[PDB]
RNA sequence: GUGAACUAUGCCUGGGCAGGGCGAAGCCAGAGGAAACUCUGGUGGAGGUCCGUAGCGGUCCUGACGUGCAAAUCGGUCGUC
RNA sequence: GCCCUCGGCCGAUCGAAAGGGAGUCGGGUUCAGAUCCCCGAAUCCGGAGUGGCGGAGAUGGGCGCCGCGAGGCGUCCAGUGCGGUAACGCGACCGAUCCCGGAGAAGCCGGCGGGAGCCCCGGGGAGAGUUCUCUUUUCUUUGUGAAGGGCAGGGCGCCCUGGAAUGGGUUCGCCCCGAGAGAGGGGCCCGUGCCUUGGAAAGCGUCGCGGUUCCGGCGGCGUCCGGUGAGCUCUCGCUGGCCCUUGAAAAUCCGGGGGAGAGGGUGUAAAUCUCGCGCCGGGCCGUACCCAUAUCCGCAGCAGGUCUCCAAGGUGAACAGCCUCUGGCAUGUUGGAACAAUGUAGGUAAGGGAAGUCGGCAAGCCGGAUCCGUAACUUCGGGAUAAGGAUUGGCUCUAAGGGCUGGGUCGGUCGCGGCCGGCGCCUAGCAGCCGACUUAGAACUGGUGCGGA
């Protein structure tokens, strides 16, 4: 809702800050074995439990 | 009430005739729902060789004037070039559509 | 144009009305209008002394 | 906004300390003198042209006498 | 141990519910009687009142659908308002 | 700091983004934010020891002289304002503990009235549309926020004079009156309406001039005059009805009673001030967007579910249905071509008319309104739209139903108009003007159609 509390705004701020793709130099790092961010959230598919 | 109706440009380039347009108004005016005879001499139309004054002593209306000149332009197949605007109070001046 | 015709009385009919007579023109509104008219007339007559208090009261009650 | 009736009252509020500005608005029928002070905008309306002119002459110095044209 | 975000019921604080029909008490007038009163015409606008919207519900078609639009929905017809 | 005096919030605290709760509006601006940014107008709360400036408190009388007198001299005594018979008013107009009250703070339903907004009608503009014929036409547009001041309007069981039956005022309904009617004169409250300040400089509509790759450019003209109403929707008010139902509390703010106290010795004074102006400040958190036949829940862009606000024209009883404007959309997760059966949904059907079937299931019939006319039975309320019948279009008329004004005998003289009077009898009222929607009747008319969907 538009009526938020400060700490639910902080929670959503953290979640949308970390819903972000992986950088591309990570793949060039030695011994990487990670291809994409595997825990990306889409707002329509998987909902925050909050 | 001196509803000066002014058309210098079209008679300037010779595409309409002020005399027969004055005749058109002289027949098809209305005063209390009567055509011809100017209500019985109660409205007076003079043409000063480039424009027409329609002096009167009754509550006659210039929106009726604009309606009649639009009717004349439509009848003589002219209102794709000409356009009746209010250049001032108590007067209507025809203008050409953008060049 | 149809409002002008209905002013002259056209399309008012008996096959043109769908609500009841009280729905189209209420009897309470009719009676209220009549009482206001007649009471105002009685008050004017009493003011101009065409009638007096006693005639006014009997005519008011009637 | 306050509306002032007399020239003497207008002059003392014009020479008041907090009087920030004066704007002169020339209307068709009259002239308005709007002095901007701290809390209110005060307006004086004059119908006489020569009286408005001599008031413009007799306005105290050290003020903004801005015409609105 | 965890649940009354559904539902059941109480409480607190808010929101909502066209248009019409019938015409209770109270009241005004006229007429008839010795009274008691009676009759007539209005006025008035009552009711877990009636027809019927929104809303709430869910009768029947044992209609549609029945690997559905839907792990109970849809249409017409209905109940109440 | 100690002592004295006084003291129930007698119970922490939490609990509402719909209850209570001071005080912000107009215009502009973005790719996306605005009552939050910019511009312009305000306002509330808190603060002021040296008090910031005004104004109020507050500045008058008595007696002796001088001085023509005015006016001065000295002495003595007041002064916590004043007006109105009153309701109450005025710009301030001392005052504590304590006490009393009020506001916050009251249901649902009905009926009327006032105000606005919307809708509607008649003209004037401006710009568009139609012009085969007609149409002085059709469509669009035709502003003034908050906060001050003034005036309408509405309301008042508020005041004074006076005394009412031949009872009278008065509402749609009521209701009111010797516990004070009608009448006459006032007062208060509300004022969201109008005028003004704001305010035309802005906005809007048109007509133009020049380019800062896009100026809150620059200019002209305009933004006018009226009328209706059981209209609808808000809102304010009055008065009823209903209830073995009587429809919060508290923060918070105000008024009064009382008078412990405080203020100065007559000064160009004090205490004090809910008056006017001025000065400073207002932190913290939310604020985008969706709000649902695609942003939520139902595993999904799911025919389900999910609380609200605003609400145009026509027909019509109507927020019914049907069509249209503002706004919105692209047919609901695809298209093309054919038009078999069987379906699903919708129609029609000769003659019969429930013979069908468990069963009139389903479908059909009926339907609105106006005028008649309505049975048994009954708890006397009802039954009841019982049952039954007639009418219904279009067009042209005729009646009836209202609201404003003025009805004046004569200069007997002058303040072609005015002061007092000889001067005169609509008194069954007329005369003029304005304005609605209805209802009833009649004629004509149509391929008997007319609640035509
Ligand atoms: Mg979801
Ligand atoms: Mg619950
Ligand atoms: Mg009922
Ligand atoms: Mg229903
Ligand atoms: Mg169903
Ligand atoms: Mg079935
Ligand atoms: Mg019912
Ligand atoms: Mg205690
Ligand atoms: Mg709390
Ligand atoms: Mg709250
Ligand atoms: Mg937005
Ligand atoms: Mg204004
Ligand atoms: Mg009285
Ligand atoms: Mg302008
Ligand atoms: Mg312009
Ligand atoms: Mg928003
Ligand atoms: Mg859905
Ligand atoms: Mg789930
Ligand atoms: Mg449809
Ligand atoms: Mg389709
Ligand atoms: Mg498609
Ligand atoms: Mg879809
Ligand atoms: Mg058959
Ligand atoms: Mg047959
Ligand atoms: Mg059978
Ligand atoms: Mg059989
Ligand atoms: Mg058989
Ligand atoms: Mg059936
Ligand atoms: Mg029966
Ligand atoms: Mg007929």
UniProtKB/Swiss-Prot annotation, chain A:
Keyword list, A-Z: Cytoplasm, Ribonucleoprotein, Ribosomal protein
PROSITE patterns linked to this entry: RIBOSOMAL_L39E (PS00051)
Quaternary structure and partners: Component of the large ribosomal subunit. Interacts with IMPACT.
UniProt-listed GO biological process terms: antibacterial humoral response; antimicrobial humoral immune response mediated by antimicrobial peptide; cytoplasmic translation; defense response to Gram-positive bacterium; innate immune response in mucosa; translation
The protein's name in its UniProt record: Large ribosomal subunit protein eL39
SS bond partners: none
Described purpose of this protein according to its UniProt entry: RNA-binding component of the large ribosomal subunit. The ribosome is a large ribonucleoprotein complex responsible for the synthesis of proteins in the cell.
Any one GO molecular function term: RNA binding
GO CC terms of this entry: cytosol; cytosolic large ribosomal subunit; cytosolic ribosome; extracellular space
InterPro entries the UniProt entry points to: Ribosomal_eL39, Ribosomal_eL39_CS, Ribosomal_eL39_dom_sf
Location of this chain's protein in the cell: Cytoplasm
Main localisation: cytoplasm
Gene3D superfamilies associated with the record: Ribosomal protein L39e
UniProt record similarity statement: Belongs to the eukaryotic ribosomal protein eL39 family.
Curated annotation (Swiss-Prot), chain B:
First-listed, main subcellular location of the protein, grouped into a coarse class: cytoplasm
One GO molecular-function entry: RNA binding
Any one GO BP annotation for this protein: cytoplasmic translation
Domain of life, per lineage: Eukaryota
Family: Belongs to the eukaryotic ribosomal protein eL22 family.
Misc note: Binds to Epstein-Barr virus small RNAs and to heparin.
Quaternary data: Component of the large ribosomal subunit.
Protein name (record): Large ribosomal subunit protein eL22
Organism (species): Homo sapiens (Human)
From Swiss-Prot, chain C:
Family: Belongs to the eukaryotic ribosomal protein eL19 family.
Changes after translation: Citrullinated by PADI4.
Organism whose genome encodes this protein: Homo sapiens
Superkingdom as given in the UniProt entry: Eukaryota
Quaternary state and interactors: Component of the large ribosomal subunit.
Coiled coil: none
Protein name as it appears in the record: Large ribosomal subunit protein eL19
Subcellular compartments: Cytoplasm
Function according to Swiss-Prot or TrEMBL: Component of the large ribosomal subunit. The ribosome is a large ribonucleoprotein complex responsible for the synthesis of proteins in the cell.
From Swiss-Prot, chain D:
Protein family membership: Belongs to the eukaryotic ribosomal protein eL38 family.
Gene behind this protein: RPL38
Gene Ontology biological process terms, A to Z: 90S preribosome assembly; axial mesoderm development; cytoplasmic translation; middle ear morphogenesis; ossification; protein-RNA complex assembly; regulation of translation; sensory perception of sound
Location in chain, cross-link Glycyl lysine isopeptide (Lys-Gly) (interchain with G-Cter in SUMO2): 3, 8
Domain of life (superkingdom): Eukaryota
Single GO term (MF): structural constituent of ribosome
Principal subcellular localisation of the protein: cytoplasm
The name this protein goes by in its record: Large ribosomal subunit protein eL38
Record note on quaternary structure: Component of the large ribosomal subunit.
Keywords: Acetylation, Cytoplasm, Isopeptide bond, Ribonucleoprotein, Ribosomal protein, Ubl conjugation
Keyword Acetylation attributed: yes
Gene3D superfamilies: 3.30.720.90
Organism: Homo sapiens
Modified residues (N6-acetyllysine): 8, 66
InterPro entries, alphabetized: Ribosomal_eL38, Ribosomal_eL38_sf
A Pfam family the protein falls into: Ribosomal_L38e
GO CC terms in record: cytoplasm; cytosol; cytosolic large ribosomal subunit; cytosolic ribosome; eukaryotic 80S initiation complex; focal adhesion; postsynaptic density
Compartments where found: Cytoplasm
Role of this protein: Component of the large ribosomal subunit. The ribosome is a large ribonucleoprotein complex responsible for the synthesis of proteins in the cell.
């Amino acid at each position: 809702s538009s009526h938020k509390t400060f700490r639910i705004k902080r929670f959503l701020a953290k979640k949308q800050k970390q819903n972000r793709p992986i950088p591309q130099w990570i793949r060039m790092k030695t011994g990487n074995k990670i291809r994409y961010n595997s825990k990306r959230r889409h707002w329509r598919r998987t909902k925050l439990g909050l | 009430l001196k509803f000066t109706l002014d058309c210098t440009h079209p008679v300037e380039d010779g595409i309409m005739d002020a005399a027969n347009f004055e005749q058109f108004l002289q027949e098809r005016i209305k005063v209390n729902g009567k055509a011809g005879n100017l209500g019985g001499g109660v409205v007076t139309i003079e043409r000063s060789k480039s424009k027409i004054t329609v002096t009167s002593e009754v509550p006659f209306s210039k929106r009726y004037l604009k309606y009649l000149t639009k009717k004349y332009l439509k009848k003589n197949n002219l209102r794709d070039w000409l356009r009746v605007v209010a250049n001032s109070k108590e007067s209507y001046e025809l203008r050409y559509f953008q060049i | 144009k149809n409002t002008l015709a209905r002013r002259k009385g056209r399309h008012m009919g008996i096959g043109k009305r769908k609500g009841t007579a009280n729905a189209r023109m209420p009897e309470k509104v009719t009676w209220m209008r009549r009482m206001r008219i007649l009471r105002r007339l009685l008050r004017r007559y009493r003011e101009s002394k065409k009638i007096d208090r006693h005639m006014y009261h009997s005519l008011y009650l009637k | 906004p306050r509306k002032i009736e007399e020239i003497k009252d207008f002059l003392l509020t014009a020479r008041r300390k907090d009087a920030k500005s004066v704007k002169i608005k020339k209307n068709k029928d009259n002239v308005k003198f709007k002095v901007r002070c701290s809390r209110y905008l005060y307006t004086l309306v004059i119908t006489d042209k020569e009286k408005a002119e001599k008031l413009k002459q007799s306005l105290p110095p050290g003020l903004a006498v801005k015409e609105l044209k």
